Amino acid sequence: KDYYQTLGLARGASDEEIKRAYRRQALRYHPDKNKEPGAEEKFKEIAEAYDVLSDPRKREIFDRYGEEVKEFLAKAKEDFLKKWESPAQNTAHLDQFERIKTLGTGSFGRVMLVKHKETGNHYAMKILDKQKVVKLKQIEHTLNEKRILQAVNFPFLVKLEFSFKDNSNLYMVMEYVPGGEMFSHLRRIGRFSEPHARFYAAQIVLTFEYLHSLDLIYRDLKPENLLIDQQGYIQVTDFGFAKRVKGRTWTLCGTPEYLAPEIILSKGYNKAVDWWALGVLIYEMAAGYPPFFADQPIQIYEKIVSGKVRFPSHFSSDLKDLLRNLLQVDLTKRFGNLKNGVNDIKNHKWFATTDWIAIYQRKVEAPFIPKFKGPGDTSNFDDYEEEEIRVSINEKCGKEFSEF
Amino acid sequence: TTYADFIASGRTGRRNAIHD
Ligand SMILES: Cn1cnc(Br)c1C1=CN(c2ncnc3nc[nH]c23)CCS1
């Protein structure tokens, strides 16, 4: 409950500002003129918001909710920029790892379960072919990916443990999350109850607050890129499209259903497309299907710029309100991109039940803890045809991936 | 119905990304 927003003030108002803003806001919800849409509680909310901000000792302890976060992030930025400036390189070698099965393949390259012969531990290893990456004009996205992932550190982001290259491949070794992708469960359980969705969505919300404070845009929020760990919590993978963006940026990339309008249109965009995608994720989670689909992507982009979302009937009224505000086609009105930034999502009626402190601390009861079968289980994961990895006797594209 | 349309649109599988 943010007293500063309830009084429509900024964290640095003066002592007269809170007294007049209290009198300006108490009349706009007075129990005699605007005692209509149940706003007698918005009036009490204003009444309690003055009593705390008027008291310089009550205000000081309240100002320690923001300041704790402001500091938490400051140190996280500093820890990020030290790693950004000196990105780890060649921190392992292929022949340290026993290649087990394949865990997934696709538009990136190949992700296999591996085993470090010595520490006898379990990792995911993503193999990218240098020649195919330069083929897919994805050299700058691949270099980014390793650089943003080795430098970030957050409970809900997968952790890159090692990285290295040989003559024709780029190798990336990260923590092994065994519970499988949220996609496979969301399509087996059919959909998610609104509290279940609220669980995952809050982690995405804290993770986007972290990433955006680092000036990062993630640009691939999708249930196929979220994993569930043994505590039922969320681990994000695929940083193939993540960019460090202090201003605007222009690449149309992502996944058609999840693209914000401004990505599809030729105007630049900001972090705010990550909040749009979050609206798609909460919608697909709570309904079973994404808000905009079609067999041809251009028809998906027609729906996306229409600014028309049909909501399902079992969609709560508070969810319908949060979604109307995340799927706003005008990024100058979209939630997350307004004056109070992410706090508009956090202090929203659909998120009144949720403890952002406790969600961070991994304390909450995860409404679904997947099936555990020991150390190397690939049961929560589809099977794939195995290829053998050839290693050319000539270095390929040594110039393009110097930085890797 | 929408659900029947979602099974229709061939997009109930893993969605590959676009690099455009
Ligand atoms: C879809 N996708 C794009 N890039 C990547 Br990497 C992926 C995938 C992630 N999978 C992973 N499974 C288990 N633990 C992991 N740790 C990091 N990733 C892990 C398997 C499916 S492929």
Side-chain angles (χ1 to χ4, degrees), chain A residues 103 108 111 124 126 158 174-177 225 227 237-238 381:
Chain A
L103 260 193
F108 39 107
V111 196
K126 188 206 280 233
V158 86
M174 32 212 70
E175 208 263 290
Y176 178 51
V177 202
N225 289 333
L227 311 194
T237 193
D238 207 351
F381 272 111

Side-chain angles (χ1 to χ4, degrees), chain A residues 102-113:
Chain A
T102 315
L103 260 193
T105 51
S107 332
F108 39 107
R110 176 181 283 278
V111 196
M112 308 183 0
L113 173 51

Side-chain angles (χ1 to χ4, degrees), chain A residues 229-283:
Chain A
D229 56 32
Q230 336 204 0
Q231 308 155 91
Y233 277 78
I234 261 190
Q235 296 262 110
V236 195
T237 193
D238 207 351
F239 280 63
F241 288 144
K243 193 170 190 186
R244 180 138 202 254
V245 166
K246 273 158 158 246
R248 256 157 87 236
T249 203
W250 282 275
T251 306
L252 194 183
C253 44
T255 312
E257 283 107 317
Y258 278 70
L259 302 184
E262 52 264 35
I263 308 187
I264 289 140
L265 300 60
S266 62
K267 76 179 54 133
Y269 53 99
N270 197 345
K271 324 140 173 41
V273 300
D274 270 2
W275 296 119
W276 176 279
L278 167 70
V280 182
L281 190 93
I282 298 166
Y283 187 123

Side-chain angles (χ1 to χ4, degrees), chain A residues 107 138 181 183 187 222-224 241 252-255 257 284 289 293-294 310 382, chain B:
Chain A
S107 332
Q138 289 293 115
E181 334 176 43
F183 178 78
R187 300 250 167 292
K222 98 184 37 182
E224 298 101 300
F241 288 144
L252 194 183
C253 44
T255 312
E257 283 107 317
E284 191 170 303
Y289 52 88
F293 55 90
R310 186 245 182 188
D382 305 342
Chain B
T1 178
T2 304
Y3 185 98
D5 313 326
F6 182 43
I7 308 312
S9 75
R11 320 240 57 183
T12 167
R14 271 197 197 72
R15 281 142 312 191
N16 49 354
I18 63 88
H19 306 270
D20 200 88

